[PDB]
Amino acid sequence: IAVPAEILGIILPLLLGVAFLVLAERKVMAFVQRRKGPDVVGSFGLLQPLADGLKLILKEPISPSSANFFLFRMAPVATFMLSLVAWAVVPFDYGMVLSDSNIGLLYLFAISSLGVYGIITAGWSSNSKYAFLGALRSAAQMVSYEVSIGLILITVLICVGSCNLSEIVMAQKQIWFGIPLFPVLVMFFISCLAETNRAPFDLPEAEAESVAGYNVEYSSMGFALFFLGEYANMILMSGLCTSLSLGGWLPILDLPIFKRIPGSIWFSIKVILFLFLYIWVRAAFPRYRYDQLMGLGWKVFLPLSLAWVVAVSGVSVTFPWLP
Amino acid sequence: MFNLFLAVYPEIFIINATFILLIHGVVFSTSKKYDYPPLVSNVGWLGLLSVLITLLLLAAGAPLLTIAHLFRNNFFRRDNFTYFCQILLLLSTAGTISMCFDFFEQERFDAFEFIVLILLSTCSMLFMISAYDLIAMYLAIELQSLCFYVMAASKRKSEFSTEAGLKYLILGAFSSGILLFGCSMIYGSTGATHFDQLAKILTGYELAGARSSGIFMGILFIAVGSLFKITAVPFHMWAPDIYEGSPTPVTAFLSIAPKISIFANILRVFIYGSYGATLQQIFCFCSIASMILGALAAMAQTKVKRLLAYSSIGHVGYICIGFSCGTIEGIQSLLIGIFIYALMTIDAFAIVLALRQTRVKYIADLGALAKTNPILAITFSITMFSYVGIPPLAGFCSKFYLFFAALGCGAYFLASVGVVTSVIGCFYYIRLVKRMFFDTPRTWILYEPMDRDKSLLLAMTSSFITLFFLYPSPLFSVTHQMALSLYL
């Protein structure tokens, strides 16, 4: 019926957006670094993702024969499932949701919790022990920063009585929650940066460095699926950031000239600014050591998140400012 | 402090004192300014002080513990029975803390987290004794269970400690699962969790029938969990191994403190709520097994800790005969036996910790003790005879009053099995006394003197045990009043 059509219309444009997102990351990083990104495969490099995908498809696969063939193959499948089903709930405007779950926030938190298993199984199923150690490190980092992310979600849930993203936005109608909670938004942005192993806290992508990663053993399509899952998670958490601290499909100042824009355009624009911030932070800053980032996650963001939860609860309970 | 919390000042004070002690110990044990001092002794002294202060609070605020009756009715109900049970529990905890001080300094066990867990577990047993619901019961039981897991496995590099911790872990988790399934069955087939609601639903209808089969299974599984908590032979297999493997203060605390709390919980969940002849039959079978196999296995033991564990199992079997009669005199006998057994166990484990200085392991190690330490030999022989049930000492009082409750019980089979077991199990106590007094071994194990902390406690306990037959009226009256106040 219409549900498979909606699911396909969510999934395929998401893959196109991920491809153009890696292309945009290349272009923005190059323009930052006083150079030009992919410009020779199509006009302005618009066909570069297509060429890359076709090359990856046409590349002949190799079988590691690691005695864990099923677990080796299914881990990128698992993370791809997790990214897609996480994207299954995010709203885009008033009524553009597949599952209008009343517990949408906790659903996304649970899906983020499940995300470590793909990397853990990928590291274990690989023959090399370096990949296993890197997978363990990445899993632990995602664990700590997801604890921080959950505390930030609790702050937002204190601000808004409901638990579904659509009603969250409907409450965001007034002040966007970013004006009241800009430090909370900053902490959530850094936590989601460390959640997807992007920007600083980039352990798996430091392959030229001694940490190596969990994708060393993986073949063409395994690596491609892991990359697609990571970038889909990046877009997902940018959407989470804009739905939580920027009002989602809501204009600025509620002027009637701004209401001519559908609102899905507003959500897309905010997601684009968040992705630009992702690439900006990745290009502009060095990376943390594993111990440094773990101590920072467990000692800097967790106490601050707890303190902000307490402060928001105290502000809301004391005054009649409660929903 | 709003006036409802008059009902929970002892628990609140003990919790806050535990938190303060934990913070102080960590901040001054991770301190490079000093030489990373061993704070176990300081934290233990402060914890003993906190136990004494909360004991004073609970004793003086006897009518104030009943404040906010309906407000606290969901979680717990406090009365004279719980008051006296908590008084005895605090006394036992204070004695255990005081008598384990010398173990710390000499054996270098300098983790104040042991004292922190002592305090937290004591609060858990307080909540258990007060508990009046199927939820607070489980929460308190699990709190002490986790505390005791960490306690048994406290010595990290010790193979015995690690193995005992793993065994106690697995078996306690199994018992928790069984008890949880029983609670689930009762909730599903009854609709109730509060003890008053269970009593109202269950009274007037026997548990053995086509109706309330789920209720019967839930009650049986909860009884199984409680029996595991008291080391009955169908579920006793953990008690000797963990009692031996865990450090001696840990096993002393395990043998002394949880017994009274679990038995008060059993009285409040079974005698009041689910009072029915099938439960007394279950505990009758458990008591028969406990006495018989405790005597049989302790006859074959050659280690002091294992012999103490099996003696504890047998005395739990006697407490179980007292329960399985389930009358006014039966419950009074249960309380008398619990008090006497706690006193005797405190005595025995104080003597064991006194002999721990020279690392006593076997029964033969304390041989020729009548020459090196005469008064200690007489004291330990008096304790062994009290365990036997020889009249002039305190153990015989609980013994004959249990047997009298069994004769008025109608359980002639139970009384005969108990007395035959009492005759059978005298042999290993007599063997201990022989080892101290009669044998002339080729080589002697000289034992270093005691600490004052253990010496004062041992002197008081031995004086109480030896001279209890001159004046048992206070204990008998208190236990009778507690048994009467269980219902009205």
Binding site: - | M1, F2, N3, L4, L6, Y9, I12, F13, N16, A17, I20, L21, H24, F28, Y34, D35, P37, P38, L39, S41, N42, W45, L46, L49, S50, I53, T54, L56, L57, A60, G61, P63, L64, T66, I67, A68, H69, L70, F71, R77, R78, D79
Partner: protein, 99 residues
């Protein structure tokens, strides 16, 4: 949230008030309650000092004992004052003051 102050056992002495406020109970502290607080705090401080000599932290041990003793003694004094003011204890003096 509804709260009920009714106790299971009836007070054996005349009740000045069933649920006295915290400030009123604190202000009801007689010289005996102050002696209770002082004795408990002093016992705790002395125990802390005597136990902290071996580790080497006498000041810190006295401080920890002082906090513990202040908490315990204040709890005991408040308990006695409230029990007297609700009629659970022989509150002859404040019953006379109320009369």
């Amino acid at each position: 949230m509804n709260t009920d102050i009714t106790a299971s056992t009836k007070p054996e002495y005349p009740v000045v008030d069933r649920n006295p406020p915290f400030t009123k109970v604190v202000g009801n502290f007689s010289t005996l309650d102050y002696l209770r607080f002082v004795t408990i705090t002093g016992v705790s401080v002395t125990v802390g000092y005597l136990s902290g000599i071996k580790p080497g932290i006498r000041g810190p041990s006295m401080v920890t004992g002082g906090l513990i003793g202040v908490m315990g003694g204040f709890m005991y004094a408040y308990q006695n004052s409230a029990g007297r003011l609700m009629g659970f204890f022989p509150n002859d003096d404040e019953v006379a003051r109320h009369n």
